Amino acid sequence: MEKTHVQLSLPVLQVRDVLVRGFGDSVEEVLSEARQHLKDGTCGLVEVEKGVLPQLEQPYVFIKRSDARTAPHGHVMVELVAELEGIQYGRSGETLGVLVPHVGEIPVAYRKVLLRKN
């Protein structure tokens, strides 16, 4: 009875503050853990710039834009895509950032998203 999408406000973290630098050790695990942390309100977002990904741990979980016409209630529609060793699991639009566990780091902003569940 999970609605297909959920409105979330994600804390945006600076990469050097992140204490837990990924969600796990395989593509399936990181997608599973990302979904669980999103559900629990314990997921942050790191915006990708030069130097960011080498400071985080693979596999990566990205949120990517899933369409261009609808940003309901100010929230960009996104979906999850994982990456390991240059191979991506899913295809989607432009990256908004990389998801990481949030364990109390102080954010620099919040990013409003409408996230596709499954």
Ligand X SMILES: Nc1nc2ccc(F)cc2s1
**Which residues of the shown chain bind ligand X in the complex (CB under 6 A)?**
2, 6, 35, 38-39, 115, 117-118
Q: Between residues 50 and 118, which has the closer beta carbon with respect to ligand X?
A: 118
**What does residue 3 show for φ and ψ, rounded to 5 degrees?**
-55, 155
CB of 70 to ligand X, least distance (A): 18
- Side-chain-side CA neighbours of 9 within 13 Å: the count stands at 6
CA-based torsion, 82, 86, 89, 95: positive or negative: positive
Q: Between residues 9 and 55, which has the closer beta carbon with respect to ligand X?
A: 9
CB of 114 to ligand X, least distance (A): 11
